[PDB]
């Protein structure tokens, strides 16, 4: 009875729960403690769900349901109340503190006053009753909060002008986003909320130090914690305005840095020119001052000492005091080096590392100077080095220090940089410093180019930090348009900061040319400013940016780093390249970097370690097998060295802990000397590079390590706690776990490698072919970490290429310049905001999908050391330390090296996911998860029966191994076959359950179950491993299975096994027992829904029923017209709960088609678990049938956006709604695909990740026997109208089959794109013959042969091109008719002018040429006098064409495709025939301003006329009218279906609904619901609207149109008018 | 031993630099030294008059652009290319001379 | 342990793979010219 | 008035500058016009039916590109800028570009340094004509250097 006790506990908790209220400037009482209420509700929901899991939940089901209801109402209220509260706070901070906004923007100021009045009324009403429920049960509370949020968000977007003025007031505001700038302005009084916004405004100022009163700014602080204390603290009470005291803080920071630098230099001059240094005093000096200040002091001291020594030798014959300077530098270096081998606090350790790097640079420079025998300070060997000159005499503190290189002179910016990672001053870095300083002297820009990973961006940042400048890195991409770059340049000019536009060439070339103007104007302004005649009194040089005068600060500069010769890159215009001084960065000095890094980390053997590790990287890069994901550049070496340092530190800590645990004996020197640096380096190399290795490269690299580092071995630690968590998690997820060499050792090893790489890197890439356990690996690792460390782990799976890049990152409106967050940007911003405590959780953003340089290269700054996401609007998002960017890909064929070098690579081979693990997972899931307890018992029994076969070297594994040797239409993947087999076995279990249900008295015995399961397993293996191949491969697989297996099989000698089914009695029964020789009704002959059952038909119907019953997506692949749609609709008729919806993919299909279909047929509803998309009908399963799934274009990077969208919606069970970036989970929706073989032209093979989930069945053409049977059935059914002709059905169908076979053989797709022949031609043949024979009461054999020949000509000769082909068709028709119909009078039946028309009689009877010509002349005279006065000259081909057009206009959904040279009379003849048949001709009037919306309006009008007014329309359309691909897409949808789903929406949809209701009433039908009315509208449009498409006989144009709109070659009868003969 | 003995045309190999690396590390393993202590000693001689010791490797097909090599000494020439008869490359200890 | 064979197996592997691919493609082209097989997208491009 | 083509605001500024200069007689230069061939066709059609001032001049600096409309090429006069044919021509052009007042400066040794530098530039640029031997790749040794 603990349920009632816990419910009473929660009742008391909620009853005693009161809402905490805190005041705000004596205005209102805000809610405080959001996290407490949030996790209280979360744990209460978990408790209620756990109760629901309990069996005793039934007695308290209603109470718990109501409790869940009110808890979900609390969630709904307080998920938006917090946002409303925060937004009101930082909007009132703007609408009260600032008085300018009242006069500037009064109307929404009054609106906000009203909204604030409402909000304060609500808050007071809450304050009267602090109880949670009494706040909750308030009427209309939720709607009031939603409306308040709506109005406040409306106001927030309408403050752009005031924000621009604010950014103008304080220059540094330009790097602050919309929401962040409103947050800063509103919370000026509440400075405690601005601490998280300083990091994006200054170089290293992450927070400011405030007094107890929060009224005086005492100093600043960095992310590390280093503090700078202002000499004169600034009081914000005196300067209430945010910008004024912010500027005072900046100036005071500069002044205090200058003064502290002066004091530090004065102090360190003692350490210089000193024979010996006391380590205690030097460590005290290092601890006293900041890292940048101590580095600067050391640099100044060394430079002054070297200058003084050089000045002594001015005579040349003097002594060499440079030796004293070198000895001093070496002594100081030894002091610091000995300080490193012992423990230090992290800040002091970083300071020591920086100083060691700088002093190594100084020692190298001094040694070079001594070797060069330099004696004069004016020599270039000393001028080229970067020298620092200090002036304590200077009155201005900021100009006390001057930095010079060659003839360039700079002033230290004194911008606090924090603790940044310096770079080893390699010779290439010195070259970069020289070149960039020379460029800055000439007031140019710097353009260091070269391959990625050569330290281009980092060199620029290091140089900018050397001068103490504010360096900004903007990850440029193609949406950095002219205006955004103008804004960025304005910000840089006003602030006085450097701009590093890395990946500059990624911009559009036109945009580069446009930005050249701004660059040139800024450079000219700086050049004028540098002139000494300019003075402080005159106004600073104002440059014109974006039609605005902007003050240009001297300190600014523009640097662009570009990577030539890669994908997704442009070529810079020459007028732009001449403004930048380029520098080549191709080969960084790797050995020096490694040596200095290892020396600074505390390695005693750093030289040997570097000399062994750097050639090792070249050895790996040259010997290891070339692969797309391999990287051995400078970034890899940097990661290895950092990992080695961390491993050394943790080993030292471990040794200290061991020594203090076992006795007490600790000596830092003893630990340092006795430490295997070789082993540490090998362990780091293995932890960083082994994961990326392929299976056959691991031993190669291990042998290479043994060759370069002999005597040391790798002993990877056994993470026993992590392994225990992995074991438990694999237990809870039905996964196979194994340690070492057991089944699953490689997979868990890969999981551990993934854990290590996550520990090291913030960007990962789980690379490996589809079906290698990447998804499960990272899922299990996430859950194990959650269960081990106690921190909740969440993941956001984003498909990058399933949505457009604008939807993925965001977009900027070119009109209003307002930023809309994308998918990834919204997630990252929400995590950064931490409004619901997301920073305390492990956040993983997984990019499951294809990678190309178009979308991933915008993440270059995220995966770099910058860890910033740069937006076109100048905003930058700092990556939280707990966020990991993961890429789950199958190949990296298209990604550039810039992406590859940034991500820790973990390679999952197909050997990692052994088939045994898949079999065990299937068996465990079968034994655990019920399929609908009787279900459980039957299902476990079936699992036990299938156990002997689902083993290593079993029947299934051997058959699967043999399967890849066969030829399949689509590429065979292991998981496709396995999933198909598992679904079919689940269907077998459901069949057993149904058999038990139908027999309550007699449930199925064990023997029946055993035999049935064995036979069905064999059947399912046969139909899964060869369901997507020809008949020959199916037979061969059957023969192989018969050879290998031991179960009973059919005893038939020649009949293949696949011809047999597994009856529920547990015995083989041939499929032919289910193939009756049915007799079709005469009036249903060749009807669209009539199917003659044959062997292939019933087999494929059973297979489709089995797969769809599981709601498993499937694809039917086969040649056009083979019967895929017929088979699908026949099988779906046995499932009354599934409603099919038609989709027609083309070359330009986008996910917008699927979204429009979802909007039309389904609805989004808000649920406690999130947004769920379900069909409007209750209890029905929508089935989306994609007719041409593989036509959508593959980009240059081998992807299809709609295919990725479908794969995301299938595997992940949902998609993302780009309107608000909310995950939408599909419910009661499945997908069925149809497609031609990928070998057919215009067909693109599906990605292996998509084919994993979808079984493929191959629907080949019916054989001559099947065709004979089907159309003999139709002919026998049809020929019952004429009893005398009843004996000719067999020869008639034989002749039809023979002629169709020879027509397929003679004409192929090679000659012409439209030369396709299928059983559709036979169906239309039988339909035409039946329609001709329907009204007639008697008719001799010759008349029947004449009708047959006429239909043969109208089908097989209409589409032909060459005259020889038509002659061949005529002769072959003659020969076939003579062969199959001897002893008939050829002349009466086969006179060459075979013409049939219903114009001269009520019946479709043969018509002589002359009377038809006279009738056409009379009708032409009437047409001239009535509609079109354009005289026409009649000839035989005109009569034939008008007869064909009349034939097409009399068929339902009969569209025309007229092909011929222009001016042949196609449109005129179409109009004339439509005028006879009463069709009202409609043509679209195209002008130069005609766009997509005009076409949509024309389509709406024609559909309204043809569906609601029941007015027959001949929609004549020409290829010249096709201005865009949207025209063709809409026409394709209309032709194929008869209705466009997204055409009608909003007001137009309601108007159409009213018109359809009126039309149905006019026809007398009673329909009121929208679905039935729309179906009737579609039926009327199908029956009334006809489309005549006219186009020129282009060769490549026809091929292009066969792919951009397949409907014209399937639904439209093709007539080749050609040129006049 | 046969693999080390045979003469290989560097042009025909897919990755000749990996061949150079392989011979480098083979000789380094033979002498148990480090790579940066190893330099190149290249001797150009006729195939018939060629002797390969433990550190020599046979390379054919190397073309000399604008020079002629007679008795292991280069002379500037007006011929576009001069085919080297047989290139024998050796790995020896660096003398930093 | 022999780097020579480490590089050397890679050479032979790539040689065999590319040789097999080229021979199969050329045999397919020959069969197309004889008309005994149909042309696929990849085969049509290779013919191009 | 020099305007770089590539942006819509660039098109508007160019149109305004041309409309002002055809009356004021000032000069107008448009850079990298080869990126907007359709706007080139529109501009050529505008130019044909126009009566400009006596001193008005319009310069359309472009990269040699087949996408430039033929009618614009026929309407205007083409100047081809490219590597000078030889060392002598290269030095002649280099000396022509440099103002005479700059070379004839107070130190009499500046002229010899300029001659040496011009000879070096000529040798460097003429070697570039020989891609495999003179250098290793087609470097952008140009007037900026
Ligand atoms: N440790 C395991 N033991 C047993 N079965 C497993 C294990 N890991 C994965 N599987 C199964 O193997 C299959 C692979 O699934 P998963 O999504 O992890 O593959 P993947 O290689 O990441 O695929 P994709 O390229 O489609 O993302 C699934 O059927 C899964 O249930
Ligand atoms: N002189 C150096 N000393 C130490 N590390 C360096 C040096 N130069 C570059 N690096 C490292 O190499 C990497 C270079 O990355 P980055 O400069 O972004 O490459 P690129 O600019 O070519 O894209 C950085 O992670 C940096 O730590
Ligand atoms: N067993 C059969 N009985 C009757 N008609 C058949 C049979 N098999 C094929 N057909 C004919 O073949 C045509 C197949 O068309 P469809 O299913 O649309 O092919 P696809 O989907 O490949 O375009 C149908 O019109 C149908 O009349
Ligand atoms: N049989 C014919 N006799 C005389 N003129 C004809 C005939 N057929 C077409 N024309 C001429 O063609 C013109 C109409 O061409 P049209 O049908 O619009 O070309 P298209 O078929 O390319 O649309 C008419 O002006 C008519 O004079
Ligand atoms: Mg970079
Ligand atoms: Mg996966």
Swiss-Prot record, chain A:
Gene: DYNC1H1
Quaternary organization: Homodimer. The cytoplasmic dynein 1 complex consists of two catalytic heavy chains (HCs) and a number of non-catalytic subunits presented by intermediate chains (ICs), light intermediate chains (LICs) and light chains (LCs); the composition seems to vary in respect to the IC, LIC and LC composition. The heavy chain homodimer serves as a scaffold for the probable homodimeric assembly of the respective non-catalytic subunits. The ICs and LICs bind directly to the HC dimer and dynein LCs assemble on the IC dimer. Interacts with DYNC1LI1; DYNC1LI1 and DYNC1LI2 bind mutually exclusive to DYNC1H1.
Disulphide-bridged cysteine pairs: none
Record family assignment: Belongs to the dynein heavy chain family.
Region (AAA 3): 1079-1328
Region spans: AAA 1: 412-643
Sequence segments annotated as region (AAA 2): 724-975
Region (AAA 4) location: 1422-1621
Taxonomic placement: Eukaryota, Metazoa, Chordata, Craniata, Vertebrata
Domain notes: Dynein heavy chains probably consist of an N-terminal stem (which binds cargo and interacts with other dynein components), and the head or motor domain. The motor contains six tandemly-linked AAA domains in the head, which form a ring. A stalk-like structure (formed by two of the coiled coil domains) protrudes between AAA 4 and AAA 5 and terminates in a microtubule-binding site. A seventh domain may also contribute to this ring; it is not clear whether the N-terminus or the C-terminus forms this extra domain.
Disease: Charcot-Marie-Tooth disease, axonal, type 2O: An axonal form of Charcot-Marie-Tooth disease, a disorder of the peripheral nervous system, characterized by progressive weakness and atrophy, initially of the peroneal muscles and later of the distal muscles of the arms. Charcot-Marie-Tooth disease is classified in two main groups on the basis of electrophysiologic properties and histopathology: primary peripheral demyelinating neuropathies (designated CMT1 when they are dominantly inherited) and primary peripheral axonal neuropathies (CMT2). Cortical dysplasia, complex, with other brain malformations 13: An autosomal dominant disorder characterized by global developmental delay with impaired intellectual development. Some patients show signs of peripheral neuropathy, such as abnormal gait and hyporeflexia. CDCBM13 is associated with variable neuronal migration defects resulting in cortical malformations.
Domain of life: Eukaryota
UniProt name for this protein: Cytoplasmic dynein 1 heavy chain 1
Subcellular location: Cytoplasm, Cytoskeleton
Binding-site residues for ATP, renumbered to this chain: 450-457, 768-775, 1118-1125, 1460-1467
Residues of the full protein shown: 1457 to 3098 of 4646
From Swiss-Prot, chain D:
Record text on subunit structure and interactions: Homodimer. The cytoplasmic dynein 1 complex consists of two catalytic heavy chains (HCs) and a number of non-catalytic subunits presented by intermediate chains (ICs), light intermediate chains (LICs) and light chains (LCs); the composition seems to vary in respect to the IC, LIC and LC composition. The heavy chain homodimer serves as a scaffold for the probable homodimeric assembly of the respective non-catalytic subunits. The ICs and LICs bind directly to the HC dimer and dynein LCs assemble on the IC dimer. Interacts with DYNC1LI1; DYNC1LI1 and DYNC1LI2 bind mutually exclusive to DYNC1H1.
Positions where Phosphoserine occurs in the chain: 96
AAA 6: annotated segments: 1-145
Protein name: Cytoplasmic dynein 1 heavy chain 1
Places the protein is found: Cytoplasm, Cytoskeleton
Disulfide bonds: none
Portion of the full sequence shown: 4067 to 4211 of 4646
UniProt domain comment: Dynein heavy chains probably consist of an N-terminal stem (which binds cargo and interacts with other dynein components), and the head or motor domain. The motor contains six tandemly-linked AAA domains in the head, which form a ring. A stalk-like structure (formed by two of the coiled coil domains) protrudes between AAA 4 and AAA 5 and terminates in a microtubule-binding site. A seventh domain may also contribute to this ring; it is not clear whether the N-terminus or the C-terminus forms this extra domain.
Organism: Homo sapiens (Human)
The family this protein is said to belong to: Belongs to the dynein heavy chain family.
Function: Cytoplasmic dynein 1 acts as a motor for the intracellular retrograde motility of vesicles and organelles along microtubules. Dynein has ATPase activity; the force-producing power stroke is thought to occur on release of ADP. Plays a role in mitotic spindle assembly and metaphase plate congression.
Annotated gene: DYNC1H1
Disorder association: Charcot-Marie-Tooth disease, axonal, type 2O: An axonal form of Charcot-Marie-Tooth disease, a disorder of the peripheral nervous system, characterized by progressive weakness and atrophy, initially of the peroneal muscles and later of the distal muscles of the arms. Charcot-Marie-Tooth disease is classified in two main groups on the basis of electrophysiologic properties and histopathology: primary peripheral demyelinating neuropathies (designated CMT1 when they are dominantly inherited) and primary peripheral axonal neuropathies (CMT2).
UniProt superkingdom: Eukaryota
């Amino acid at each position: 009875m603990a349920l009632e006790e816990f419910l009473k506990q929660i009742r008391e908790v909620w009853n005693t729960y009161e809402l905490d209220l805190v005041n705000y400037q004596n205005k209102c009482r805000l809610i405080r403690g959001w996290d407490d209420l949030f996790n209280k509700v979360k744990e209460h929901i978990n408790s209620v769900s756990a109760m629901k899991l309990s069996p005793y939940y039934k007695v308290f089901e209603e109470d718990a349901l109501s409790w869940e209801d009110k808890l979900n109402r609390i969630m709904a209220l307080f998920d938006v109340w917090i946002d409303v509260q925060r937004r009101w706070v930082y909007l009132e901070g703007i609408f009260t503190g600032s008085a300018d906004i009242k006069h500037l923007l009064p109307v929404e100021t009054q609106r906000f006053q009203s909204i604030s009045t409402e909000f304060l009324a609500l808050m007071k009403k809450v304050s009267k009753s602090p109880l949670v429920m009494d706040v909750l049960n308030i009427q209309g509370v939720q709607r009031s909060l939603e409306r308040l949020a709506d109005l406040l968000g409306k106001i927030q977007k309408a403050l752009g002008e005031y924000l621009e003025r604010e950014r103008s007031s304080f220059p540094r505001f330009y790097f602050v986003g919309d929401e962040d700038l409103l947050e800063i302005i509103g919370n000026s009084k509440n400075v405690a909320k601005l601490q998280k916004h300083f990091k994006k405004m200054f170089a290293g100022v992450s927070s400011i130090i405030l007094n107890e009163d929060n009224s005086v700014v005492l100093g600043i602080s960095s992310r590390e914690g280093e503090e700078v204390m202002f000499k004169t603290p600034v009081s914000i009470t005196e300067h209430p305005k945010i910008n004024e005291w912010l500027t005072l803080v900046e100036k005071e920071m500069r002044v205090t840095l200058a003064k502290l630098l002066a004091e530090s230099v004065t102090e360190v001059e003692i350490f210089g020119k000193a024979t010996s240094i006391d380590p205690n005093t030097y460590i005290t000096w290092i601890d006293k001052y900041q890292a940048q200040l101590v580095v600067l002091s050391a640099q100044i001291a060394w430079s002054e000492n070297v200058e003084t020594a050089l000045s002594s030798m001015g005579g040349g014959g003097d002594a060499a005091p440079l030796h004293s300077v070198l000895s001093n530098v070496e002594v100081t270096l030894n002091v610091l080096a000995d300080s490193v081998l012992m423990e230090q606090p992290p800040l002091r350790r970083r300071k020591l590392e920086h100083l060691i790097t700088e002093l190594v640079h100084q020692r190298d420079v001094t040694r070079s100077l001594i070797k060069s025998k330099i004696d004069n300070a004016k020599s270039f060997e000393w001028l080229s080095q970067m020298r620092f000159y200090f002036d304590p005499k200077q009155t201005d503190v900021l100009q006390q220090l001057s930095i010079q290189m060659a003839n360039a002179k700079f002033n230290y910016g004194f911008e606090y940089l924090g603790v940044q990672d310096k770079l080893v001053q390699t010779p290439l870095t010195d070259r970069c410093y020289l070149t960039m300083t020379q460029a800055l002297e000439a007031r140019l820009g710097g353009s260091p180019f070269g391959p990625a990973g050569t330290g281009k961006t980092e060199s620029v940042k290091a140089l900018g930090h050397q001068l103490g400048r504010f360096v900004l890195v903007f990850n440029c991409d193609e949406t950095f348009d002219f205006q955004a770059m103008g804004r960025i340049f304005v910000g840089l000019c006003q602030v006085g900061a450097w701009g590093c536009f890395d990946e500059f060439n990624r911009l559009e070339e036109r945009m580069l040319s446009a930005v050249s103007q701004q660059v040139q104007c800024i450079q000219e302004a700086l050049r004028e400013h540098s002139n000494p005649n300019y003075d402080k009194t005159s106004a600073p040089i104002t440059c014109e940016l974006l039609n605005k005068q902007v003050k240009v600060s001297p300190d600014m500069a523009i640097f662009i780093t570009m990577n030539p010769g890669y994908a997704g890159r442009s070529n810079l215009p020459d007028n732009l390249k001449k403004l930048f001084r380029s520098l080549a960065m191709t080969k960084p000095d790797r050995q020096l970097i490694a040596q200095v890094m290892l020396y600074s980390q505390g390695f005693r053997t750093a030289e040997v370690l570097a000399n062994k590790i750097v050639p090792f990287f070249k050895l790996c890069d040259e010997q290891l097998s070339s692969q797309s994901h391999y990287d051995f550049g400078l970034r890899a070496l940097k990661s290895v060295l950092v990992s080695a340092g961390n491993v050394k530190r943790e080993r030292i800590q471990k040794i200290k802990r061991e020594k203090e645990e076992r006795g007490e004996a600790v000596d830092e020197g003893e630990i340092a000397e006795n430490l295997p640096e070789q082993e540490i380096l090998i362990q780091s190399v293995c932890e960083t590079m082994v994961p990326k290795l392929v299976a056959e490269d691991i031993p190669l690299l291990f042998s290479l390590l043994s060759d370069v580092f002999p005597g040391v071995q790798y002993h990877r630690g056994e993470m026993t706690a992590l392994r225990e968590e992995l074991k438990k998690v694999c237990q809870e997820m039905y996964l196979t776990y194994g340690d070492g060499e057991e089944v699953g050792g490689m997979w868990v090893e890969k999981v551990l490698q993934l854990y290590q790489i996550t520990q090291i890197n913030h960007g990962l890439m789980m690379v490996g072919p589809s079906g290698s356990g990447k998804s499960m690996a990272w899922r299990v690792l996430l859950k194990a970490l959650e269960r081990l460390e106690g921190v909740e782990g969440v993941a956001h799976i984003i498909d990058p290429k399933a949505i457009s890049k604008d939807h993925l990152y965001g977009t900027l409106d070119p009109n209003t310049r307002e930023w809309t967050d994308g998918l990834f940007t919204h997630v990252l911003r929400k995590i950064i905001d931490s409004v619901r405590g997301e920073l305390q959780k492990r956040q993983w953003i997984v990019f499951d999908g294809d990678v190309d340089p178009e979308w991933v290269e915008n993440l270059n700054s995220v995966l770099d050391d910058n860890k910033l996401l740069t937006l076109p609007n100048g905003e930058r998002l700092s990556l939280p330390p707990n966020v990991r960017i993961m890429f789950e890909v199958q190949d990296l064929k298209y990604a550039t090296l810039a992406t590859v070098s940034r991500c820790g690579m973990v390679w999952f081979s197909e050997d990692v996911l052994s088939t045994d693990m898949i079999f065990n997972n299937f068996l465990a899931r079968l034994r655990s998860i019920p399929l609908d307890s009787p279900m459980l018992q039957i299902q476990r029994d079936a699992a036990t029966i299938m156990q002997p076969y689902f083993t290593s070297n079993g029947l299934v594994t051997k058959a699967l191994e043999h399967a890849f040797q066969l030829e399949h239409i689509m590429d065979l993947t292991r998981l496709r076959c396995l999933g198909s087999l598992f679904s079919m076995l689940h269907q077998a279990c459901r069949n057993v359950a149904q058999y038990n249900a139908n027999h309550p008295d007699f449930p199925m015995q064990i023997e029946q179950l055993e035999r049935y399961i064995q036979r069905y397993l064999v059947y399912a293996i046969l139909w899964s491993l060869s369901g997507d191949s020809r008949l020959k491969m199916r037979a061969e697989l059957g023969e192989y299975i018969r050879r290998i297996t031991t179960v009973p099989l059919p005893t038939a000698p020649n009949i293949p096994i696949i011809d047999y089914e597994v009856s529920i009695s547990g015995e083989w029964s041939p499929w032919q027992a289910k193939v009756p020789q049915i007799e079709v009704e005469t009036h249903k002959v060749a009807a669209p829904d009539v199917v003659v059952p044959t062997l292939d038909t019933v087999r494929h119907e059973a297979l489709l029923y089995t797969w769809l019953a599981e709601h498993k997506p499937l694809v039917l692949c086969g040649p056009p017209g083979s019967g895929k749609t017929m088979t699908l609709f026949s099988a779906l008729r046995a499932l009354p709960d599934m409603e099919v919806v038609g989709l027609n993919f083309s070359s330009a299909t986008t996910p917008e088609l699927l979204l429009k279909t979802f909007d039309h047929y389904c609805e989004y509803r808000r649920t406690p678990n999130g947004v769920v998309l379900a069909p409007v009908q209750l209890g029905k399963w929508l089935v989306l049938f994609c007719d041409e799934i593989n036509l959508p274009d593959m980009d240059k990077y081998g992807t299809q956006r709609v295919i990725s969208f479908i794969r995301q919606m299938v595997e992940h069970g949902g998609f993302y709604r780009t309107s608000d970036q909310t995950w939408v989970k599909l419910e009661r929706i499945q997908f069925v695909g149809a497609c031609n073989p990928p070998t057919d032209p215009g067909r693109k093979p599906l990605s292996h990740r998509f084919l994993r989930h979808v079984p493929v069945v191959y629907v080949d053409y019916p054989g001559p026997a099947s065709l004979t049977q089907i159309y003999g059935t139709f002919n026998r059914a049809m020929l019952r109208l004429i009893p005398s002709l009843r004996t000719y059905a067999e020869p008639l169908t034989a002749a039809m089959v023979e002629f169709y076979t020879m027509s397929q053989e003679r004409f192929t797709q090679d000659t012409q794109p439209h030369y396709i022949y299928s059983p559709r031609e036979m169906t239309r043949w039988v339909r035409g013959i039946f329609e001709a024979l329907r009204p007639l009461e008697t008719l001799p054999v010759e008349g029947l042969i004449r009708i047959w020949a006429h239909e043969a000509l109208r089908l097989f000769q209409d589409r032909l091109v060459e005259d020889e082909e038509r002659r061949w068709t005529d002769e072959n028709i003659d020969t076939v008719a003579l062969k199959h119909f001897p002893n008939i009078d050829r002349e009466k039946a086969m006179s060459r002018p075979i013409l049939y028309s219903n114009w001269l009689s009520k019946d479709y009877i043969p018509v002589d040429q002359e009377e038809l010509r006279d009738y056409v002349k009379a009708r032409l005279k009437v047409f001239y006098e009535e509609e079109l006065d354009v005289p026409l000259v009649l000839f035989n081909e005109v009569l034939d064409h008008v007869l064909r057009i009349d034939r097409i206009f009399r068929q339902p959904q009969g569209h025309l495709l007229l092909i011929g040279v222009s001016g042949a009379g196609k449109t005129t003849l179409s109009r004339f025939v439509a005028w006879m048949n009463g069709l009202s001709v409609y043509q679209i009037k195209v002008h130069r301003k005609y766009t997509g919306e005009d076409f949509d309006e024309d389509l709406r009008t024609v559909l309204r006329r043809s569906g609601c007014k029941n007015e027959k329309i001949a929609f004549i359309m020409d290829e010249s009218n096709v201005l865009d691909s949207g025209f063709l897409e809409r026409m394709n949808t209309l032709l194929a279906n008869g209705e466009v789903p997204g055409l009608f929406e909003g007001d137009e949809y309601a108007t159409l609904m009213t018109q359809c209701k009126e039309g149905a009433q006019k026809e007398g039908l009673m329909l009121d619901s929208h679905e039935e009315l729309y179906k009737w509208f579609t039926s009327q449009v199908i029956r009334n609207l006809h489309v005549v498409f006219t186009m020129n006989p282009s060769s490549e144009g026809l091929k292009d149109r066969a792919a951009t709109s397949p409907a014209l070659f399937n639904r439209c009868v093709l007539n080749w008018f050609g040129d006049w003969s | 031993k046969e693999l080390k003995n045979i003469h290989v045309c560097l042009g025909g190999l897919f990755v000749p630099e990996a061949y150079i690396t392989a011979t480098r590390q083979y000789v380094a393993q033979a002498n148990s030294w480090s790579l940066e202590e190893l330099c190149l000693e290249v001797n150009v001689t006729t195939s018939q008059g060629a002797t390969l010791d433990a550190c020599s490797f046979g390379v054919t097909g190397l073309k000399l652009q604008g020079a002629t090599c007679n008795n292991n000494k280069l002379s500037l020439s007006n011929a576009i290319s001069t085919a080297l008869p047989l290139t024998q490359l050796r790995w020896v200890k660096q003398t930093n001379t | 342990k022999d780097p020579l064979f480490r590089f050397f197996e890679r050479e032979v592997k790539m040689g065999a793979k590319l040789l097999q691919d080229v021979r199969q493609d050329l045999a397919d082209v020959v069969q197309v010219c004889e008309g005994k097989k149909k042309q696929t997208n990849y085969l049509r491009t290779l013919i191009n | 008035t020099s305007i770089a083509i590539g942006s819509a605001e660039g098109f508007n500024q160019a149109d305004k500058a041309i409309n002002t200069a055809v009356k004021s007689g000032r000069w107008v230069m448009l850079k990298n016009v080869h990126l907007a061939p359709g706007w080139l066709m529109q501009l050529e059609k505008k130019l044909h039916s126009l009566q400009p001032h006596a001193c008005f001049r319009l310069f359309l600096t472009m990269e040699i590109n087949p996408k430039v409309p033929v009618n614009l090429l026929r309407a205007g006069r083409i100047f081809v800028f490219e590597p000078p044919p030889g060392v002598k021509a290269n030095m002649l052009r280099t000396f022509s570009s440099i103002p005479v007042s700059r070379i004839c400066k107070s130190p009499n040794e500046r002229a010899r340094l300029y001659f040496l530098l011009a000879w070096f530039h000529a040798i460097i640029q003429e070697r570039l004509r020989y891609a495999p031997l003179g250098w290793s790749k087609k470097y952008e040794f140009g007037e900026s250097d």
